[PDB]
Amino acid sequence: ESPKEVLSRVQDAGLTLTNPNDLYWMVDFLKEKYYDNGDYYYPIKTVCDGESIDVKFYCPFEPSLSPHYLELYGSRDERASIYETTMKKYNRINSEKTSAICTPYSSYGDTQIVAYFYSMMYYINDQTAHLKLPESEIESELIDILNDDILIYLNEFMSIFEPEDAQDLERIWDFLDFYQPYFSKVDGKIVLDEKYLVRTPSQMPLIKTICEYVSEQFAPSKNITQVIWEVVRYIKGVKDEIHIRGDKSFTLSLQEYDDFRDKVTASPMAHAVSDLTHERFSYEAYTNPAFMELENRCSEIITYFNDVCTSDRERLDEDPFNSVFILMDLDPSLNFAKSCDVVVEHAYNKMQAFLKLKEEILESASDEEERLALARMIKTREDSLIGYVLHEVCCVEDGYARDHKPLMKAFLEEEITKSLAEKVKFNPV
Numbered sequence: 149e150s151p152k153e154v155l156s157r158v159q160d161a162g163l164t165l166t167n168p169n170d171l172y173w174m175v176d177f178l179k180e181k182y183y184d185n186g187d188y189y190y191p192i193k194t195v196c197d198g199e200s201i202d203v204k205f206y207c208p209f210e211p212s213l214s215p216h217y218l219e220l221y222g223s224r225d226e227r228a229s230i231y232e233t234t235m236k237k238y239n240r241i242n243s244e245k246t247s248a249i250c251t252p253y254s255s256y257g258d259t260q261i262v263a264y265f266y267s268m269m270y271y272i273n274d275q276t277a278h279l280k281l282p283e284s285e286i287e288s289e290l291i292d293i294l295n296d297d298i299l300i301y302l303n304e305f306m307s308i309f310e311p312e313d314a315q316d317l318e319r320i321w322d323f324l325d326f327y328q329p330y331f332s333k334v335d336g337k338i339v340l341d342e343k344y345l346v347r348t349p350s351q352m353p354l355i356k357t358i359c360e361y362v363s364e365q366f367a368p369s370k371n372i373t374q375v376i377w378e379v380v381r382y383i384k385g386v387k388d389e390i391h392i393r394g395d396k397s398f399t400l401s402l403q404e405y406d407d408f409r410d411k412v413t414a415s416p417m418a419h420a421v422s423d424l425t426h427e428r429f430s431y432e433a434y435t436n437p438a439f440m441e442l443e444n445r446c447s448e449i450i451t452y453f454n455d456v457c458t459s460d461r462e463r464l465d466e467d468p469f470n471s472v473f474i475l476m477d478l479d480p481s482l483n484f485a486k487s488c489d490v491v492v493e494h495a496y497n498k499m500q501a502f503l504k505l506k507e508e509i510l511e512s513a514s515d516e517e518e519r520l521a522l523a524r525m526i527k528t529r530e531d532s533l534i535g536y537v538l539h540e541v542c543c544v545e546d547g548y549a550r551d552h553k554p555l556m557k558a559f560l561e562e563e564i565t566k567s568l569a570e571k572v573k574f575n576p577v
């Protein structure tokens with residue numbers, strides 16, 4: 149479309165998330181107004197407990213949106229038929245938007261697989277959220293189902309895993325930890341004792357779709373061990389969350405919250421698959437302690453940004469898993485607005501720590517092939533970081549985000565109207 153057409157639409161109808169074209173113009177506006185002017189502080193305008201939350205997320209990476217977003221959005225009803233879900237829930241998760249904006253330069257199928265991984269986290273997360281309820285309302289049978297489901301999901305990933313190197317089989321086996329007694333090494337594979345295949349989990353079609361894609365696209369030619377490793381890390385992290393939420397006593401320090409979020413943020417699973425889509429790839433990076441720390445900084449930054457944006461909804465849930473609330477519980481002088489400011493500052497320091505690790509990792513590369521592989525893998529994580537910021541910035545239509553931001557709808561409609569008008573005015577120059 150031409151700037152004049154979209155300007156006419158925006159003046160009449162405003163911005164939406166149901167017309168997928170609008171998101172291309174929103175992302176283009178954000179790059180021209182912020183990144184292109186050397187301003188890497190993106191605005192977040194929301195509320196928490198009636199307090200105005202007006203902050204900026206620092207992220208110095210180039211904004212972009214996948215060219216496949218149009219087709220992904222156009223096929224969302226068929227995608228959603230895979231899931232056990234209402235459309236209301238599917239629309240708020242909006243994995244078409246998440247993947248298109250965090251994975252902007254991949255093929256259609258390599259973008260969709262990231263959508264699937266993020267949706268898996270969201271659906272498992274909302275099943276775990278039953279434990280947020282007061283103890284009076286918790287149903288032990290739903291918790292039994294949840295615990296059984298994640299073991300069966302875990303085995304489905306185990307079932308596509310047949311590493312070429314025996315040390316890689318041992319890497320995963322030793323990493324199973326408290327799940328290890330349920331499995332055995334057969335065939336050169338890890339297999340769940342069939343005694344425990346006692347149900348079909350509600351999202352088994354999703355998990356089978358993921359496993360089939362990784363099996364058919366990457367397992368023939370690539371070492372997929374890190375994908376398996378990150379899924380094991382995630383599933384164990386969910387079990388850790390079940391334990392903490394089931395205990396109804398939340399005593400995590402901020403450092404322990406960080407260590408926990410390192411496991412459950414799910415972006416490391418998306419990165420592991422995206423790493424496999426590039427010829428520049430170093431499997432040895434995943435056991436480099438500095439690279440492992442870089443991945444942890446990335447998960448924590450996304451966590452802290454998410455903590456600010458979801459604070460009001462989680463406050464009403466009485467959910468303690470939020471750095472904003474951890475800081476308030478430690479420091480009685482903080483209200484929600486002041487706590488959000490401290491979290492944003494922590495996210496800035498983590499971003500600087502991420503950039504310091506990046507320079508160290510690239511300097512340590514042994515040869516050109518390894519340097520180019522590491523630079524590509526770090527770029528993939530940077531894509532996720534700016535993508536997540538713009539994801540939260542662009543929550544402009546109620547029902548199509550986890551946390552709708554009516555002040556951002558108003559702010560972006562006002563600012564993009566002026567930017568499009570300036571485009572039309574100077575046309576064709």
Ligand SMILES: CC(C)=CCC/C(C)=C/CSP(=O)(O)OP(=O)(O)O
Pocket residue numbers: 246250266273413414415450451454458462467469536
């Ligand atoms: C969508 C992407 C790319 C990453 C964000 C992942 C993330 C931080 C999710 C929050 S998990 P949690 O805080 O337990 O969930 P809610 O209470 O916010 O529903």
Ligand SMILES: [Mg+2]
Pocket residue numbers: 454455458462
């Ligand atoms: Mg949250």
Ligand SMILES: [Mg+2]
Pocket residue numbers: 462469470
């Ligand atoms: Mg949380």
